[PDB]
Design an enzyme around this catalytic site. Structure first.
Site, PDB file in Angstrom:
ATOM      1  CG  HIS A  65      -1.312   1.358   1.696  1.00 59.39           C
ATOM      2  ND1 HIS A  65      -2.166   2.181   0.996  1.00 59.39           N
ATOM      3  CD2 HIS A  65      -0.970   2.038   2.816  1.00 59.39           C
ATOM      4  CE1 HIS A  65      -2.329   3.311   1.661  1.00 59.39           C
ATOM      5  NE2 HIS A  65      -1.613   3.250   2.768  1.00 59.39           N
ATOM      6  CG  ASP A  99       4.976  18.064 -26.782  1.00 59.69           C
ATOM      7  OD1 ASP A  99       4.144  17.646 -27.614  1.00 59.69           O
ATOM      8  OD2 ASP A  99       4.645  18.486 -25.652  1.00 59.69           O
ATOM      9  CD1 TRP A 114       6.741   3.651   4.518  1.00 53.89           C
ATOM     10  CD2 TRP A 114       7.949   4.834   3.060  1.00 53.89           C
ATOM     11  NE1 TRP A 114       6.983   4.879   5.078  1.00 53.89           N
ATOM     12  CE2 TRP A 114       7.724   5.625   4.202  1.00 53.89           C
ATOM     13  CE3 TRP A 114       8.690   5.371   2.004  1.00 53.89           C
ATOM     14  CZ2 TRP A 114       8.212   6.922   4.319  1.00 53.89           C
ATOM     15  CZ3 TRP A 114       9.173   6.660   2.122  1.00 53.89           C
ATOM     16  CH2 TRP A 114       8.933   7.421   3.272  1.00 53.89           C
ATOM     17  CB  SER A 164      10.902   6.090 -13.938  1.00 55.82           C
ATOM     18  OG  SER A 164      10.448   6.281 -12.612  1.00 55.82           O
ATOM     19  CB  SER A 165      11.554   9.798 -10.412  1.00 53.56           C
ATOM     20  OG  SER A 165      10.276   9.215 -10.221  1.00 53.56           O
ATOM     21  CG  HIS A 220      11.917  16.103   4.765  1.00 54.31           C
ATOM     22  ND1 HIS A 220      10.632  16.032   5.254  1.00 54.31           N
ATOM     23  CD2 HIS A 220      12.115  17.392   4.406  1.00 54.31           C
ATOM     24  CE1 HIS A 220      10.092  17.234   5.233  1.00 54.31           C
ATOM     25  NE2 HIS A 220      10.965  18.078   4.713  1.00 54.31           N
ATOM     26  CD  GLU A 251       9.383  10.364  -2.965  1.00 51.29           C
ATOM     27  OE1 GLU A 251      10.301  10.579  -3.779  1.00 51.29           O
ATOM     28  OE2 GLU A 251       8.243  10.035  -3.338  1.00 51.29           O
ATOM     29  CE1 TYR A 293       8.349  20.062   3.056  1.00 48.94           C
ATOM     30  CE2 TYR A 293      10.183  18.713   3.825  1.00 48.94           C
ATOM     31  CZ  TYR A 293       9.122  19.575   4.079  1.00 48.94           C
ATOM     32  OH  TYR A 293       8.792  19.970   5.350  1.00 48.94           O
ATOM     33  CB  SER A 344      -0.425  28.522  -6.872  1.00 49.50           C
ATOM     34  OG  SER A 344      -0.208  29.855  -7.293  1.00 49.50           O
ATOM     35  CG  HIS A 364      12.323  15.813  10.305  1.00 49.06           C
ATOM     36  ND1 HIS A 364      12.609  16.781   9.367  1.00 49.06           N
ATOM     37  CD2 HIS A 364      11.420  14.988   9.726  1.00 49.06           C
ATOM     38  CE1 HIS A 364      11.921  16.543   8.265  1.00 49.06           C
ATOM     39  NE2 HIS A 364      11.194  15.459   8.456  1.00 49.06           N
ATOM     40  CG  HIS A 365      12.027  11.230   9.058  1.00 46.76           C
ATOM     41  ND1 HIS A 365      10.692  11.328   8.733  1.00 46.76           N
ATOM     42  CD2 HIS A 365      12.680  12.065   8.217  1.00 46.76           C
ATOM     43  CE1 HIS A 365      10.543  12.196   7.749  1.00 46.76           C
ATOM     44  NE2 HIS A 365      11.734  12.657   7.418  1.00 46.76           N
ATOM     45  CB  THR A 389       4.885  25.586   4.530  1.00 47.96           C
ATOM     46  OG1 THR A 389       5.965  24.833   3.968  1.00 47.96           O
ATOM     47  CG2 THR A 389       3.594  24.899   4.180  1.00 47.96           C
ATOM     48  CE  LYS A 392       3.725  27.555  -1.764  1.00 41.76           C
ATOM     49  NZ  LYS A 392       4.322  27.213  -3.069  1.00 41.76           N
ATOM     50  NE  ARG A 439       5.072   4.820  12.199  1.00 41.57           N
ATOM     51  CZ  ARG A 439       5.804   5.463  11.297  1.00 41.57           C
ATOM     52  NH1 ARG A 439       5.238   5.863  10.166  1.00 41.57           N
ATOM     53  NH2 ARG A 439       7.084   5.708  11.521  1.00 41.57           N
TER      54      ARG A 439
END
Ligand code: HEA
Ligand code: HEA
Ligand SMILES: CCCCCCCCCCCCCCCC(=O)OC[C@H](COP(=O)(O)OCCN)OC(=O)CCCCCCCCCCCCCCC
Ligand SMILES: CCCCCCCCCCCCCCCC(=O)OC[C@H](COP(=O)(O)OCCN)OC(=O)CCCCCCCCCCCCCCC
Ligand SMILES: CCCCCCCCCCCCCCCC(=O)OC[C@H](COP(=O)(O)OCCN)OC(=O)CCCCCCCCCCCCCCC
Ligand SMILES: CCCCCCCCCCCCCCCC(=O)OC[C@H](COP(=O)(O)OCCN)OC(=O)CCCCCCCCCCCCCCC
Ligand SMILES: CCCCCCCCCCCCCCCC(=O)OC[C@H](COP(=O)(O)OCCN)OC(=O)CCCCCCCCCCCCCCC
Ligand SMILES: CCCCCCCCCCCCCCCC(=O)OC[C@H](COP(=O)(O)OCCN)OC(=O)CCCCCCCCCCCCCCC
Ligand code: CUA
Ligand SMILES: [Cu+2]
Ligand SMILES: [Mg+2]
Lengths: 269, 534, 51, 77, 45, 104, 236, 99, 59
Positions: free
Chosen positions: B62, B92, B127, B157-158, B241, B243, B245, B256, B290-291, B316, B319, B438
């Site tokens: 998942h 293009d 994950w 790919s990314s 992190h 990822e 963002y 926006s 921070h994780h 943020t 924004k 968890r």
């Protein structure tokens, strides 16, 4: 000129690529390679014959892709200056991504080195492992990269100048210079006191130096292709983007080798 | 037709295929979310009898399927591939075969991820696939190798899409696009494509180190032998992190644009907003641990990271304040992407406030690996990226697909997903502060109520997606009849007050980007000639 | 060759001129998409216990 | 009434203590091998490692010391 | 303004009925856990 | 000009912008750009807007001035003390309002 | 101590660290609820008074005064939020002069506790493996999935610092009542402190993934008075 | 006698001299206003790495210039740490006995 | 050997696609099609043998 023979052209400098069947084939081969090397690592298939043919079909599909791109770049003639600056910036960003993989390997070395574990004897290099001294063979294959850079930069500046006998001599001797580098690097690997499994020191040392090893054998293949299409008159005096690409690559490979060499052979022993 | 969909080096006919794999994988991932939350509905071994390894396999499926095969395709790949050449006037994209191989190496990562969950019971790690939980001693089999080969392929790919995007908006802009005149979604795809090639090399290096200490006997994280598993936590969250963002910045761009065009007002200070977004990008690398407030870092470096994550929190905030400023004073036409844009602000401000409750390294010792964390990220990831995804689809697909949807079904779909997803993730905070960890199959039966309430909510959140599937069908077979027979909304920008109808039919679309001037479904060679701008 | 453009020549599905109804393909796509974790659960529940 | 233990060392005030146990163990084996073979106030080191690091670690390191494949060697002749 | 009903009154009349409905929508967007706890057997129902 | 606009510069700029229009699109465009500012315009602007809508010869934009203004103002005492200042222009130009035209 | 059905607050206090964490979370939530209330009020006021607004003030696109006030207000609130968390983070690592030490080494799907401060005058260290009671041998009043047949037992009113590690997969020693949560990675020992201020039971669970038996891995810590703990340690 | 303190930081001086060498080669080569940016960057990088690996052997000669002044290191700093580790045990348990 | 303008005059003046336009491009693509079809269809018959769990017959 006439409007009638101006509207018979591209109307913008950018590339319009005809539909080519080499994303789908090399993606098929990448899938087959990933599944077969996940399947043979546990003894499900008998031999490495199938991961061999999967790696081979990936290699020959990608070299057919590069055949299509050299035919489109110098025969159909579309790589104008906008597309040339585009592919130059794309290669710069790709190599900026490669040096970050090298930075991750250096992070692994630094994190397990400058805070050594209590099972290594609390000293870097660990106990018993006879570290490679940096002054015998590392000095030869750190001066050979500087000599390779010097001869590839005079071959470049002779290609821009106009002489052929100098711009070919520099490329031939930089190819044989870095393949002499690769062979003496394999000579360094085949008599060393530690293997890739012997502790964390051998693991991260062989990881970093082996990734640089594979990077320069890919550079040697790139430079062999560039020497072939320099002999067969493809490279011009002002449209050699596929050669400026590889000299940028070999100079940044030289500087990442000196970083790897200093902190893998002097500080880490 | 084989050369138009299998070879197909044209950035319009690659984005449709990106979206097709996106809706396929999102259906598979929400089937897994339904199975997880259906098994966690009551204490005692439910529908999957015993078998906690199957639940671990389902939760890693998942998580990793819905992250790397729905949100990242349907935000980066699909929307960037269709819109980034179509907003800056390139005919293009540059490197067209590169973003064809990016799409075509996505679903083979998908099929090896699918076949990783079948062999030798299976990869269950979550994950964030950790050692020595995934090393060969405590987890034997070829399962997690295929599960991380999927991550190798999606990573490739990314990155190829990132290099593609960066060069195609650094060189092939139109005649008058200066370095700061682009619409804000182009800037979001720009900065996201930088964070990809600045981040995921470290990820692929760390996970191939995990692979070659699984199978090639090395000792990166095998601890009896020299290594340490803390190095994987560093090397993973240095991507982990950036990822998210990456996953949330095009959401900011989409929101926006839709609040700019559904309130008849330009965004309040676009230059300060893009400076805030770019500083969020270049600052999101400095807070990667921070994780890892629990694992045994010093109090000094924990003090540094709990200082720096609040300076992550401030732009943020400016924004969201600029979003309130640009919807203030407007003429808000409450259509169905504007409803998603309005809901995204509240449902992401809520998750960001509980995120800065998490960001204190003092306070993270009471909340780590606890359902409070699930309540935070299933706000800011789920509601954030997917309410922006829905406000992307319901706003752009009448122009892309050329078929207008049904409107009242879109509004019942929005209210159903809003209610039925606010009822899931809100009891997760009470489960967190009461003490539920968890990744448990299920739990000590004290907190037996909030799991039941969340499970009665997940069925509403699944039924709304079934209604979204029917919205796709009703759009695909009744597009022209929803144009004609007065079931839809036709003009997204209403005529102004003192303007006549005979004068509105002159200037039909009052856009500010190119995309709503191209005809429905646009021509395959749209910009034959360049699109000038002053 | 520039491929010809229309309202239904932008997607891989053929919708108007078929032999079967479109609802078959459009709901079978998400049927197999929604039933791949169920077949994963079945192949994992016959390998260990019962079902 | 009393429940005394090792207190707080100034050399290792961090959250991790693996270097603290390993150093106290190797310095116990450096006291009682060198100055005198057993009579000492270097029972402080014994108290410290036997209080801090687990029995599986102590058993693993003592069998490594017996086999001679110890990591940080203890100045043995 | 200068002449007319004063701005304090003509914006209080606009906003004072808005505060109660804001409190209603916030008390039912965050207060439904109280409504689901109220009927369960934990409150000796 | 991102520097602020005082009220006299506002009314002079917009009077010289209502004088120049010739089509219908121009009158409705400059009327929208005059009404979608922050202030409500003084009747020196709006009687010129009524003349500029008379020059193009169409009626309903000489009525939607009045309804947009009723949406603009803060109460109805400002609206009544406004509308008795544009009385005779509304008389000899013959435009109606909304509430007497559509009684509901 | 123990969780309660339909609860929406912390498992209550035992340690000064958990009291500080509770006070800090309530201070942070008090500073956060102003921001949540004004954000929700801005959104409600805007979308219910500008939907019935026929014109749009499209000539308002920047203003420096209000821009810098809404970028200097979150910096102020975040400084006031970060001002006491530094105090808590730098005091919750202060483990000067503890009384006794525990090792809490966590194996595959059980814990193994051991005391080795040498006042047990049988001579030895004392260890016990602390398996979960399997959920059919429960006997008419025993909390499901977080009970234990062999509890850890600690004293009241002494600072106890326990180290933690593993021999396998990374576990976590996690009690939410004592406010203690620390990842037991197999390589390093990690120490945390405690001062339990009242007698009674405290429950916790493993809060890192261990594999199949992640749920069947609880922590049960009974805190008794010091003479009863001395009697238990001498008898066991 | 200064060799102790500024040979303890060898691999700080080498790295700072490499960065300053690339800067002082780049500002020299960029004053020639005819070439591409890439050729200037690679020539500056080559000059910098040449002078840096030339200094790397000067520090080797300096390293044994330090090694005659401090014989057989890494093993007698360990015993100074050991003397400070034995004094901290004796000083502590003598006051444990008489305190 | 300065055979670039003859190749350009051939490559511009044809209708066939680019990866089939060369004269000697029949020796490069037929064995490639054969070995590629073999090399990519072949693990999809070993994947149900892995799902059933039956390993190889080695040693
Ligand atoms: C992409 C991110 C994402 C999203 C959206 C979700 C959404 C959901 N998730 Fe979660 N989840 C994670 C990522 C996500 N999740 C991660 C990373 C973990 C941690 C795993 C670990 O650490 O072990 C996790 C863990 C997790 C838990 C905690 C279990 C545990 O660890 O103990 C639960 C329990 O309820 C759960 C189930 C669900 C359910 C029922 C939804 C529902 O909201 C699903 C319904 C969603 C929709 C209906 C969205 C619409 C879908 C479409 C396809 C729209 C198509 C539109 C376009 C393409 C434009 N997942
Ligand atoms: C989409 C990616 C994404 C985004 C954008 C965020 C947003 C934030 N997150 Fe989150 N987070 C995750 C992804 C993300 N997170 C994931 C995947 C996990 C689980 C990982 C795991 O498996 O362990 C997680 C869990 C997580 C952790 C790990 C805790 C733990 O596991 O122990 C932390 C720690 O600091 C954190 C904090 C924050 C903060 C401060 C923000 C901020 O960026 C939020 C910014 C928004 C606001 C601040 C609100 C709007 C601002 C205002 C209204 C102005 C006023 C506000 C202030 C003055 C503060 N969240
Ligand atoms: C995409 C991800 C990119 C990041 C790559 C990270 C580093 C991986 C490559 C390290 C090379 C190590 C090496 O070359 O090791 C050399 C060793 C041999 O040494 P020995 O023990 O015989 O020495 C004996 C001394 N007397 O080969 C090995 O035993 C392991 C080989 C594993 C297979 C090659 C690497 C597989 C991954 C390659 C990915 C490339 C992309
Ligand atoms: C794995 C094997 C790697 C083999 C690399 C072969 C490189 C030759 C490509 C070539 O020859 O490309 C020639 C073209 C254009 O040539 P030109 O326009 O300069 O010629 C014009 C004469 N008038 O260069 C490029 O577009 C850049 C190609 C970069 C390719 C990098 C691939 C890296 C793969 C790593 C994995
Ligand atoms: C691994 C990732 C390798 C990325 C290489 C980036 C090169 C940048 C560039 O210059 O790409 C230039 C070309 C693609 O360009 P094109 O034919 O679309 O350009 C059209 C003319 N403008 O070579 C490539 O990228 C091929 C890279 C993949 C080769 C197989 C790799 C298998 C793994
Ligand atoms: C909470 C509610 C939960 C229960 C909902 C049951 C179904 C209700 C149907 C409502 C309906 O049908 O709304 C339809 C009406 C439309 O009216 P109109 O103004 O267009 O009328 C014009 C007549 N000519 O409301 C609206 O769109 C306006 C309200 C928008 C709501 C957006 C909500 C976004 C998420 C919340 C954001 C934060 C707000 C809350 C915190 C302050
Ligand atoms: C927002 C709109 C959607 C909210 C749906 C919440 C329903 C959760 C649930 O399912 O409620 C579960 C509770 C607790 O029942 P129990 O645990 O005693 O039952 C044990 C097994 N039956 O039953 C009720 O209270 C019934 C009354 C529901 C009132 C809902 C009010 C919502 C406001
Ligand atoms: C903000 C949301 C505030 C409303 C919450 C409604 C809860 C209703 C309920 O479900 O409250 C039920 C509980 C009953 O529990 P009990 O202890 O009586 O159990 C005994 C069972 N025999 O009431 C309480 O404990 C306290 C009363 C409500 C307190 C509100 C919540 C306070 C902490 C905030 C947690 C949310 C953090 C969010 C982080 C961003
Ligand atoms: Cu131990 Cu989970
Ligand atoms: Cu993060
Ligand atoms: Mg964790």
């Amino acid at each position: 000129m006439t409007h009638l023979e101006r509207s018979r052209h591209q109307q913008h400098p950018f590339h319009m690529v005809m539909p080519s069947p080499w994303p789908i084939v090399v993606s098929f081969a990448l899938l087959s390679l990933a599944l077969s090397t996940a399947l043979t690592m546990h003894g499900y298939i008998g031999n490495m014959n199938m991961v061999y043919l999967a790696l081979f079909v990936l290699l020959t599909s990608s070299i057919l892709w590069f055949r299509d791109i050299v035919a489109e770049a110098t025969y159909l003639g579309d790589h104008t200056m906008a597309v040339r600056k585009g592919i130059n910036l794309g290669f710069l960003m790709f190599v900026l991504s490669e040096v970050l993989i090298f930075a991750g390997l250096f992070w692994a070395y630094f994190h397990s080195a400058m805070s050594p574990d209590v099972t290594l004897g609390a000293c870097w290099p660990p106990v018993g492992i006879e570290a490679v001294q940096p002054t015998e063979l590392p000095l030869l294959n750190t001066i050979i990269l500087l000599s390779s850079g010097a001869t590839v930069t005079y071959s470049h500046h002779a290609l821009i100048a106009g002489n052929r006998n100098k711009a070919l001599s520099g490329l031939l001797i930089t190819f044989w210079l870095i393949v002499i580098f690769v062979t003496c690097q394999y000579i360094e690997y085949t008599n060393a006191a530690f293997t890739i499994s012997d502790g964390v020191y051998g693991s991260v040392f062989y990881a970093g130096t082996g990734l640089h090893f594979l990077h320069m054998v890919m550079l040697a293949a790139m430079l062999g292709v560039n020497y072939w299409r320099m002999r067969n008159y493809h490279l011009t005096a002002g449209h050699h983007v596929g050669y400026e690409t590889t000299i940028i690559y070999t100079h940044v490979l030289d500087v990442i080798w000196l970083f790897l060499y200093v902190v893998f052979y002097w500080w880490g022993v | 037709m084989v050369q138009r969909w299998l070879y197909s080096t044209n950035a319009k006919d690659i984005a449709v295929l990106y979206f097709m794999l996106a809706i396929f994988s999102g259906m598979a991932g929400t089937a897994m979310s339904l199975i997880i939350r259906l098994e966690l509905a009551a204490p005692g071994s439910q529908y999957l009898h015993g078998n906690s390894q199957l639940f671990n396999v389902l939760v890693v499926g998942h998580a990793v399927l819905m992250i790397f095969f729905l949100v990242m395709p349907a935000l980066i790949g699909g929307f960037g591939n269709y819109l980034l050449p179509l907003m800056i006037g390139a005919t293009d994209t540059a490197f067209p075969r590169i973003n064809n191989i990016a799409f075509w190496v996505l679903p083979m990562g998908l099929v090896c991820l699918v076949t990783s969950t079948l062999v030798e019971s299976g990869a269950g790690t979550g994950w964030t696939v950790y050692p020595p939980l995934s090393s060969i001693q405590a987890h034997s089999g070829p399962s997690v190798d295929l599960a991380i080969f999927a991550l190798h392929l999606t990573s490739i790919s990314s990155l190829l899409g990132a290099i593609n995007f960066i060069v195609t908006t650094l060189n092939m802009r139109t005649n008058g696009m200066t370095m700061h005149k682009l619409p804000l979604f182009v800037w979001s795809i720009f900065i996201t494509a930088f964070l990809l090639l600045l981040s995921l090399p470290v990820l692929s290096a760390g996970i191939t180190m995990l692979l070659l200490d699984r199978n090639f006997n090395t000792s990166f994280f095998e601890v009896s032998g020299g290594g340490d598993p803390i190095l994987y936590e560093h090397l993973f969250w240095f991507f982990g992190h950036p990822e998210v963002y990456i996953l949330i910045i095009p959401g900011f761009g989409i929101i926006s644009h839709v609040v700019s065009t559904y309130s008849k007002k330009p965004v309040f200070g676009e230059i300060s907003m893009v400076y805030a977004m770019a500083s969020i990008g270049l600052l999101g690398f400095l807070v990667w641990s921070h994780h890892m407030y629990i694992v045994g870092l010093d109090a000094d470096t924990r003090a540094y990271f709990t200082s720096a994550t609040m300076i992550i929190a401030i732009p943020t905030g400016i924004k969201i304040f600029s979003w309130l400023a640009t919807i203030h004073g407007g003429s808000i036409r409450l259509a169905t992407p504007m409803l998603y844009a309005i809901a995204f602000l509240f449902l992401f401000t809520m998750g960001g406030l509980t995120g800065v409750a998490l960001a204190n390294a003092s306070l993270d010792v009471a909340f780590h690996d606890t359902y409070y964390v699930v309540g935070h990220f299933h706000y800011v990831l789920s509601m954030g990226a997917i309410f922006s995804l829905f406000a992307g689809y319901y706003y752009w697909s009448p122009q892309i697909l050329g078929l207008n949807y049904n409107e009242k079904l879109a509004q019942i779909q929005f209210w159903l997903i809003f209610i039925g997803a606010n009822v899931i993730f809100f009891p997760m905070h009470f489960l967190g502060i009461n003490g539920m960890p968890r990744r448990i199959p299920d739990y000590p039966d004290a907190f037996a109520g909030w799991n039941y309430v969340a499970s009665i909510g997940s069925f509403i959140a699944t039924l709304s997606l079934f209604l979204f599937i029917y919205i796709l069908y009703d759009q695909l077979v009744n597009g022209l009849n929803n144009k004609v027979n007065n079931k839809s909304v036709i003009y997204n920008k209403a005529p102004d007050f003192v303007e006549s109808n005979t004068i509105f039919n002159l200037n039909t679309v009052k856009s500010s980007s190119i995309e709503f001037l191209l005809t429905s479904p646009p021509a395959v060679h749209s910009f034959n000639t360049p699109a000038v701008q002053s | 060759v520039h491929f010809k453009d229309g309202v239904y020549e932008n997607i891989p599905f053929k919708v108007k001129g078929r032999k079967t109804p479109y609802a078959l393909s459009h709901f079978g796509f998400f049927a197999i998409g929604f039933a791949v974790p169920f077949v994963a659960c079945y192949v994992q529940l016959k390998k260990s216990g019962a079902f | 009434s009393p429940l005394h233990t090792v207190g707080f060392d100034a050399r290792f005030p961090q959250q991790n203590q693996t270097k603290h146990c390993w150093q106290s163990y190797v310095d116990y084996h450096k006291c009682v091998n060198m100055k005198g073979e057993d009579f000492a106030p270097c029972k402080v080191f014994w108290k410290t490692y036997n209080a801090l690091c687990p029995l599986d670690w102590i058993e693993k390191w003592d069998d490594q010391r017996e086999k001679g494949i110890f990591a940080g060697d203890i100045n043995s002749d | 303004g200068r002449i007319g009903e004063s701005w304090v009154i003509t914006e209080g009349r606009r906003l004072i009925p808005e505060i109660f409905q804001w409190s209603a929508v916030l008390s039912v967007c965050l207060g439904w856990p109280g409504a689901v706890y109220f009927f369960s057997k934990a409150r000796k129902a | 000009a991102h520097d602020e606009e005082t009220f006299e510069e506002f009314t002079a700029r917009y009077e010289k912008e209502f004088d120049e229009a010739y089509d219908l699109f121009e009158v409705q465009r400059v009327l929208n750009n005059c009404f979608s500012y922050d202030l409500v315009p003084a009747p020196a602007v709006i009687e010129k807007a009524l003349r500029a809508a008379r020059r193009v010869n169409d009626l309903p934009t000489a009525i939607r001035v009045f309804e947009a203004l009723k949406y603009k103002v803060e109460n109805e005492d400002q609206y009544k003390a406004y509308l008795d200042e544009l009385k005779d222009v509304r008389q000899e130009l013959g435009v109606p309002l909304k509430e007497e035209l559509f009684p509901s | 101590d123990v969780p309660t059905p339909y609860a929406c607050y912390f498992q209550d206090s035992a340690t000064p660290n958990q009291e500080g964490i509770l006070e800090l979370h309530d201070n942070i939530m008090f500073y956060l609820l102003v921001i949540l209330g004004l954000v929700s009020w801005m959104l409600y006021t805007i979308v219910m008074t500008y939907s019935k607004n026929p014109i749009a003030y499209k000539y308002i696109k920047h203003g420096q005064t209000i821009e810098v006030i809404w970028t200097i207000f979150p910096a102020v609130i975040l400084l006031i939020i970060a001002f006491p968390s530094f105090i808590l983070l730098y005091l919750c690592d202060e483990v000067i002069s503890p009384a006794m030490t525990i090792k809490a080494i966590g194996y595959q799907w059980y814990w193994k506790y051991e005391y080795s401060d040498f006042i047990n005058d049988s001579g030895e260290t004392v260890e016990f493996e602390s398996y979960v009671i399997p959920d059919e041998l429960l006997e008419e009043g025993q909390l499901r999935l977080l009970d234990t047949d062999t509890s850890m037992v600690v004293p009241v009113d002494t600072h106890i610092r326990f180290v933690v590690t593993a021999a396998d997969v990374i576990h976590d020693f996690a009690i939410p009542s004592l406010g203690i949560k620390v990842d037991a990675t197999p390589g390093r020992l990690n120490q945390v402190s405690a001062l339990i201020q009242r007698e009674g039971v405290f429950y916790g669970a493993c809060s890192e993934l261990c594999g199949t038996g992640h749920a069947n891995m609880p922590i049960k810590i009974e805190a008794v008075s010091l003479p009863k703990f001395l009697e238990w340690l001498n008898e066991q | 006698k200064f060799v102790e303190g500024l040979s303890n930081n060898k691999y700080k001086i080498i790295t700072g001299a490499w960065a300053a060498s690339l800067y002082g080669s780049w500002v020299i080569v960029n004053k020639d206003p005819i070439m591409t940016k890439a050729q200037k960057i690679v020539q500056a990088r080559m000059y910098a790495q040449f002078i840096t690996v030339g200094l790397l052997l000067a520090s080797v000669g300096l390293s044994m210039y330090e090694n005659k002044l401090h014989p057989n290191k890494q093993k007698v700093n360990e015993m100074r740490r050991w003397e400070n580790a034995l004094r901290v045990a004796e000083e502590e348990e003598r006051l444990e006995k008489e305190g | 050997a300065n055979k670039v303008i003859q190749l350009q005059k051939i490559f511009q003046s044809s209708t066939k696609p680019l990866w089939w336009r060369h004269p000697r491009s029949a020796l490069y693509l037929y064995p490639f099609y054969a070995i590629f079809a073999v090399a990519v269809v072949t693990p999809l018959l070993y994947i149900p043998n892995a799902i059933r769990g039956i390993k190889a017959k080695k040693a």
